[PDB]
Design a protein around this motif. Structure first.
Motif, mmCIF file in Angstrom:
data_model
loop_
_atom_site.group_PDB
_atom_site.id
_atom_site.type_symbol
_atom_site.label_atom_id
_atom_site.label_comp_id
_atom_site.label_asym_id
_atom_site.label_seq_id
_atom_site.Cartn_x
_atom_site.Cartn_y
_atom_site.Cartn_z
ATOM 1 N N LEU A 18 0.804 -1.244 0.000
ATOM 2 C CA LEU A 18 0.000 0.000 0.000
ATOM 3 C C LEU A 18 0.831 1.287 0.000
ATOM 4 O O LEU A 18 0.514 2.249 -0.697
ATOM 5 N N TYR A 19 1.899 1.301 0.785
ATOM 6 C CA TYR A 19 2.757 2.485 0.904
ATOM 7 C C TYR A 19 3.872 2.533 -0.168
ATOM 8 O O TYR A 19 4.682 3.464 -0.199
ATOM 9 N N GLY A 20 3.900 1.542 -1.057
ATOM 10 C CA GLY A 20 4.714 1.639 -2.272
ATOM 11 C C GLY A 20 6.201 1.461 -2.013
ATOM 12 O O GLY A 20 7.045 2.048 -2.720
ATOM 13 N N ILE A 21 6.511 0.659 -0.996
ATOM 14 C CA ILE A 21 7.891 0.358 -0.620
ATOM 15 C C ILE A 21 8.146 -1.134 -0.639
ATOM 16 O O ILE A 21 9.132 -1.598 -0.118
ATOM 17 N N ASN A 22 7.255 -1.882 -1.262
ATOM 18 C CA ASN A 22 7.479 -3.293 -1.508
ATOM 19 C C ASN A 22 8.836 -3.494 -2.201
ATOM 20 O O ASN A 22 9.230 -2.695 -3.048
ATOM 21 N N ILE A 23 9.573 -4.516 -1.792
ATOM 22 C CA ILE A 23 10.858 -4.841 -2.411
ATOM 23 C C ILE A 23 10.616 -5.929 -3.457
ATOM 24 O O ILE A 23 10.076 -6.990 -3.128
ATOM 25 N N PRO A 24 11.006 -5.673 -4.718
ATOM 26 C CA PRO A 24 10.650 -6.607 -5.791
ATOM 27 C C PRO A 24 11.243 -7.988 -5.596
ATOM 28 O O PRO A 24 12.344 -8.093 -5.090
ATOM 29 N N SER A 25 10.527 -9.024 -6.033
ATOM 30 C CA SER A 25 10.968 -10.421 -5.876
ATOM 31 C C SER A 25 12.251 -10.793 -6.642
ATOM 32 O O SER A 25 12.749 -11.893 -6.486
ATOM 33 N N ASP A 26 12.756 -9.897 -7.481
ATOM 34 C CA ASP A 26 14.081 -10.031 -8.082
ATOM 35 C C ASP A 26 15.196 -9.925 -7.066
ATOM 36 O O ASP A 26 16.294 -10.445 -7.304
ATOM 37 N N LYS A 27 14.930 -9.221 -5.965
ATOM 38 C CA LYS A 27 15.846 -9.155 -4.832
ATOM 39 C C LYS A 27 15.474 -10.288 -3.878
ATOM 40 O O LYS A 27 14.404 -10.269 -3.271
ATOM 41 N N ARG A 28 16.346 -11.290 -3.790
ATOM 42 C CA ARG A 28 16.060 -12.527 -3.087
ATOM 43 C C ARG A 28 17.307 -13.400 -2.838
ATOM 44 O O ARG A 28 18.308 -13.323 -3.541
ATOM 45 N N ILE A 29 17.190 -14.244 -1.824
ATOM 46 C CA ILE A 29 18.162 -15.227 -1.468
ATOM 47 C C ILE A 29 17.751 -16.490 -2.191
ATOM 48 O O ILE A 29 16.582 -16.812 -2.237
ATOM 49 N N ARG A 30 18.719 -17.214 -2.731
ATOM 50 C CA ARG A 30 18.498 -18.491 -3.393
ATOM 51 C C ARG A 30 19.294 -19.520 -2.648
ATOM 52 O O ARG A 30 20.348 -19.199 -2.114
ATOM 53 N N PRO A 31 18.840 -20.768 -2.668
ATOM 54 C CA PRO A 31 19.584 -21.854 -2.093
ATOM 55 C C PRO A 31 20.727 -22.373 -2.971
ATOM 56 O O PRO A 31 20.587 -22.426 -4.189
ATOM 57 N N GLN A 32 21.831 -22.754 -2.332
ATOM 58 C CA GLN A 32 22.937 -23.460 -2.952
ATOM 59 C C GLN A 32 22.652 -24.925 -2.706
ATOM 60 O O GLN A 32 22.427 -25.335 -1.569
ATOM 61 N N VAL A 33 22.601 -25.694 -3.788
ATOM 62 C CA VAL A 33 22.584 -27.156 -3.735
ATOM 63 C C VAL A 33 23.848 -27.611 -4.445
ATOM 64 O O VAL A 33 24.260 -26.990 -5.402
ATOM 65 N N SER A 34 24.472 -28.668 -3.941
ATOM 66 C CA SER A 34 25.752 -29.156 -4.464
ATOM 67 C C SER A 34 25.974 -30.627 -4.203
ATOM 68 O O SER A 34 25.364 -31.230 -3.312
ATOM 69 N N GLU A 35 26.886 -31.190 -4.990
ATOM 70 C CA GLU A 35 27.359 -32.540 -4.761
ATOM 71 C C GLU A 35 28.255 -32.440 -3.539
ATOM 72 O O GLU A 35 28.833 -31.381 -3.263
ATOM 73 N N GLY A 36 28.331 -33.510 -2.769
ATOM 74 C CA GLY A 36 29.325 -33.570 -1.703
ATOM 75 C C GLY A 36 29.084 -32.775 -0.428
ATOM 76 O O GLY A 36 29.861 -32.898 0.514
ATOM 77 N N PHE A 37 28.051 -31.943 -0.378
ATOM 78 C CA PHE A 37 27.484 -31.582 0.920
ATOM 79 C C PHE A 37 25.962 -31.487 0.927
ATOM 80 O O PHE A 37 25.313 -31.293 -0.118
ATOM 81 N N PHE A 38 25.418 -31.667 2.130
ATOM 82 C CA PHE A 38 23.980 -31.740 2.341
ATOM 83 C C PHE A 38 23.421 -30.379 2.654
ATOM 84 O O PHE A 38 23.912 -29.708 3.540
ATOM 85 N N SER A 39 22.452 -29.949 1.852
ATOM 86 C CA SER A 39 21.690 -28.744 2.118
ATOM 87 C C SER A 39 20.265 -28.889 1.580
ATOM 88 O O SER A 39 19.944 -29.784 0.782
ATOM 89 N N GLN A 40 19.413 -27.989 2.040
ATOM 90 C CA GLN A 40 18.004 -28.071 1.765
ATOM 91 C C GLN A 40 17.753 -27.597 0.341
ATOM 92 O O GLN A 40 18.314 -26.576 -0.104
ATOM 93 N N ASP A 41 16.887 -28.344 -0.350
ATOM 94 C CA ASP A 41 16.367 -27.958 -1.650
ATOM 95 C C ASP A 41 15.228 -26.968 -1.397
ATOM 96 O O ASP A 41 14.051 -27.275 -1.540
ATOM 97 N N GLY A 42 15.606 -25.758 -1.039
ATOM 98 C CA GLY A 42 14.672 -24.833 -0.450
ATOM 99 C C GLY A 42 14.100 -23.805 -1.384
ATOM 100 O O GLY A 42 14.525 -23.688 -2.515
ATOM 101 N N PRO A 43 13.115 -23.039 -0.898
ATOM 102 C CA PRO A 43 12.558 -21.981 -1.707
ATOM 103 C C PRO A 43 13.508 -20.832 -1.803
ATOM 104 O O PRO A 43 14.478 -20.756 -1.064
ATOM 105 N N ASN A 44 13.215 -19.926 -2.704
ATOM 106 C CA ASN A 44 13.828 -18.619 -2.656
ATOM 107 C C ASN A 44 13.219 -17.855 -1.487
ATOM 108 O O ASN A 44 12.078 -18.103 -1.117
#
Length: 838
Positions: free
Chosen positions: A238-264
């Motif tokens: 409403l107040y026009g200060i929403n932060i666009p969804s282009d600004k976001r944290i993404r998960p790192q998934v990799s071979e050889g260590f365990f991490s969550q297949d998580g949302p942005n």
């Protein structure tokens, strides 16, 4: 001060005032007008299911469509009775919101914070009253067809849930022409999708503030806090200060260590949660967002000063009405000319209020409820609760009803101690898995996604400091009385809105192949079977995996004492021996050789979780002292940081006395860099490192819980088998003794929590910080050299041996600036470390 909340039944007839049929084009699941109820000014409740998908369905899809825990029920919110329950549910929660001043202030902000009548595309001299970002069509069924009679200009619309009833981010999803105004001051009307009876869960396993008497628990969220969080998205929108969804944290998934297949995780989600996790977004990012919003507010100020005309062209009489409304909303002053103007003190005040004060963690301390400690805490299976029932939940106290046993020392949010909270089966809750498998490419194992640590991709954070930059001469960085009203307005003839809708994506389980029997195998070995018969503890992980009747233990001494049974002795002599062996083992601490930055270590973590394949070889203690703290993060690559952005200057810039300004700026900007780099390090730590260390807390608590559950199972076995004189008479003593294990587990967790917290903080200091200073030293060396040459290049011009003065400016590069917590920028971080060290 308080906006009134009106009572309604779903039965109540349409009245062309606060009960209406509304057209919501955004809802693809339901394309007719739908019945809505204005519970307070500009806030409407719409008891209907919602979906933005093309080809929407309420059915369980064949594979998961998101990285979130899900629950599907096509019947939910289908009948008029269910709609009545939902409607009254939200009215009740709104009364509860008004039960503290912070929630009164939130509601007021929503009501008077109506979206601007125009956006960037609107001419600057114009109010446009015709857009779907401000208007909703009111419709009546006349002569076999629906017909637009009026509009309303709401602030928030509150729907029931998506197909996934557990969804908590759908309210951020803005379609079409609503996105941009949400980020450019103008704002957009907000549409929430909510299911308040369905409650997400969290624990206090990693908090030193858990109950000493009850031990560690799983709690549910207070629905008022969940709904206030959702309405904080509406506030930013409403107040026009929403932060666009282009600004976001993404998960790192990799071979050889365990991490969550998580949302942005959008930056908006971090802001609205609040607290320490906001620092995952470095100040350099946060500052840009503030400065941006400031710009747009000033721009809205100028618009109000120049408005002559309107759309439609009739509405020219309404200019002053809306000049008032928006002038009040943005809280502008008038300068002596008569023009609207942004007061900077007032803007910063409003802005920080909307972004810091109005956040989940602030709310939960104000309503005196339990809540998630940090953003990436573990989620558990949710629960269901009939919140309309005053025996279960009230406006004044929430779940903490005194007359039912609940109070500050025995929370009604506790899921095991509150039998009105109905747990959901894992059968009914769909989630992703990571399948773990032995050797190439014993059985494979399933690990549910929620039981894995979230690790952010480092590129996700901020890249600003890594960009080469040029420095120049100009480089740097009382209340109104709540009054209920008829909200109908005359119909502007709006063009109809047809939105594409979202494509559905499916998601697969992950398969991971592993060289040894790791933590996830060691944890599976400790489990009981459903329908236990006759169990024994074993010292052999392969054996326990093999047979249902054998469970693995990491305490050899415990195995003999459990498996004995009651050999013609009194029952409790055996039982007390078992529990005293368990207790005394799990409270062990060993002081370590070498000079480590951690005081003591907890030795049984090795055989409990096989960290570093350390069991069998039996050398956890030395291996940990050898490898140091990073030993606990299995497979996780050595911390690294790339080269920093170099500073350089113009070739010429010969002319002017502000050749010298450039030099003062480069020096000040070098200071800003040391700061920005430390802030970037803390973000990595919070989003990538602390989460992996806490994963050991959760894994340790699971294994202490399996050992305890096995001790209890064997106690029950042996008590049925037992026939002594005292059996009936020691019954309560046995029950109480079994219950005592929760407290004993809990006290072991104080030691494990402290050990893990130390490891975590020293990783920051030993494994991260030196690498960052290295790189700041190369950046220092480089920037100094470049300042020397700037002087030497502009030798003939400017300086009449002011040149020699500029040498002493390069004696400001002698000192490094090592990382210092007793410092106003590190205050929040300091606070958090102090408290878990106590």
């Amino acid at each position: 001060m308080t906006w009134p909340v009106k009572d309604f039944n779903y039965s109540d007839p349409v009245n062309d005032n606060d009960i209406l049929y509304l057209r919501i084009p955004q809802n693809k699941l339901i394309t007719t007008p739908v019945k809505a109820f204005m519970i307070t000014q500009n806030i409407w409740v719409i008891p209907e299911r919602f979906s933005s998908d093309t080809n929407p369905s309420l059915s369980k899809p064949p594979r998961p469509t998101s990285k979130y825990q899900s629950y599907y029920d096509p019947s939910y919110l289908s009948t008029d009775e269910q709609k009545d329950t939902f409607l009254k549910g939200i009215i009740k929660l709104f009364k509860r919101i008004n039960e503290r001043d912070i929630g009164k202030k939130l509601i007021n902000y929503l009501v008077v914070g109506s979206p601007f009548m125009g956006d960037s595309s609107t001419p600057e001299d114009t109010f446009d009253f015709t857009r779907h970002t401000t208007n909703i069509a009111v419709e009546k069924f006349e002569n076999g067809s629906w017909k637009v009679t009026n509009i309303i200009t709401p602030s928030v619309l509150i729907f029931g849930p998506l197909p996934n009833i557990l969804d908590y981010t759908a309210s951020l999803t803005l379609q079409g022409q609503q996105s941009n105004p949400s980020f450019e001051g103008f704002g957009t009307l907000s549409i929430l999708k909510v299911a308040p009876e369905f409650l997400l869960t969290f624990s206090d396993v990693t908090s030193n503030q858990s109950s000493a008497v009850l031990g560690k628990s799983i709690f549910c969220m207070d629905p008022v806090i969940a709904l206030m969080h959702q309405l904080t998205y509406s506030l930013h929108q409403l107040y026009g200060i929403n932060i666009p969804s282009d600004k976001r944290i993404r998960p790192q998934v990799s071979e050889g260590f365990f991490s969550q297949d998580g949302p942005n995780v959008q930056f908006e989600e971090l802001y609205t949660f609040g607290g320490l996790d906001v620092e995952i977004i470095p100040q350099i990012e946060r500052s840009q967002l503030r400065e941006k919003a400031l710009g747009h507010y000033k721009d809205i100020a100028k618009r109000l000063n120049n408005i002559n005309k309107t759309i439609p062209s009739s509405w020219i009489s309404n200019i002053d009405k809306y000049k008032k409304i928006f002038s009040e909303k943005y809280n502008f002053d008038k300068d002596n000319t008569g023009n609207f103007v942004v007061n900077i003190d007032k803007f910063n005040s409003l802005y920080s209020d909307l972004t810091n004060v109005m956040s989940e963690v602030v709310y939960s301390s104000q309503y005196n409820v339990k809540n998630r400690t940090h953003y990436f805490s573990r989620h558990y299976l949710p629960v269901f609760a009939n919140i309309l029932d005053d025996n279960i939940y009230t406006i004044r106290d929430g779940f903490n009803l005194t007359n039912k046993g609940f109070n500050i020392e025995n929370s009604g949010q506790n899921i095991e101690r509150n039998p009105a909270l109905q747990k959901l089966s894992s059968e009914s809750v769909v989630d992703l898995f990571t399948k773990v498998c032995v050797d190439k490419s014993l059985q494979c194992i399933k690990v549910k996604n929620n039981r894995l640590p979230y690790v952010a991709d480092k590129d996700s954070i901020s890249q600003e400091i890594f960009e080469n930059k040029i420095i120049t001469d100009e480089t740097n960085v009382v209340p109104i009385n709540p009054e209920i009203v008829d909200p109908l307005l005359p119909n502007v003839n709006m063009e109809p809105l047809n939105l594409p809708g979202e494509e559905i994506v499916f998601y697969d389980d992950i398969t991971k192949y592993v060289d040894y029997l790791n933590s996830y195998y060691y944890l599976e070995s400790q489990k009981l079977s459903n329908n236990v018969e006759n169990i024994t503890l074993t010292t052999s992980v392969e054996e326990a995996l093999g047979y249902s009747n054998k469970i693995y233990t990491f305490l050899p001494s415990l195995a003999e004492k459990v498996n004995k049974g009651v050999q013609a002795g009194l029952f409790l002599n055996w039982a007390n021996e078992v529990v005293e062996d368990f207790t005394t083992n799990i409270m062990k601490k060993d002081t370590l050789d070498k000079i480590s930055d951690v005081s003591v270590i907890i030795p049984y973590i090795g055989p409990a979780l096989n960290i570093g394949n350390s069991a069998l070889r039996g050398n956890f203690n030395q291996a940990f002292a050898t490898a140091g703290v990073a030993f606990l993060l299995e497979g996780f690559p050595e911390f690294t940081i790339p080269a920093l952005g170099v500073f350089t200057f113009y070739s010429s810039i010969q002319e002017r006395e502000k050749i010298i300004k450039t030099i003062e700026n480069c020096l000040e900007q070098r200071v800003k860099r040391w700061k920005d780099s430390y802030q970037w390090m803390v973000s990595n730590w919070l989003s990538r490192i602390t989460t992996q260390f806490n994963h050991i807390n959760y894994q340790m608590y699971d294994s202490l819980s399996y050992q305890a559950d096995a001790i209890k199972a064997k106690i029950d076995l042996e008590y049925k088998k037992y026939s002594g004189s005292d059996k009936e008479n020691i019954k309560s003593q046995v029950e109480n003794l079994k219950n005592s294990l929760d407290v004993k587990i809990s006290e072991a967790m104080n030691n494990i929590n402290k050990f893990i917290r130390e490891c975590s903080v020293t990783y920051l200091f030993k494994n991260m910080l030196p690498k960052v200073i290295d790189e700041l030293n190369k950046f220092d060396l480089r920037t100094k050299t470049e300042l020397i040459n700037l002087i030497d290049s502009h030798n003939i011009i400017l300086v009449g041996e002011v040149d020699r003065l500029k040498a002493k400016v390069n004696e400001s590069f002698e000192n490094t600036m090592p990382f210092n917590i007793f410092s106003y920028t590190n205050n929040s971080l300091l606070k958090d470390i102090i408290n878990e060290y106590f």
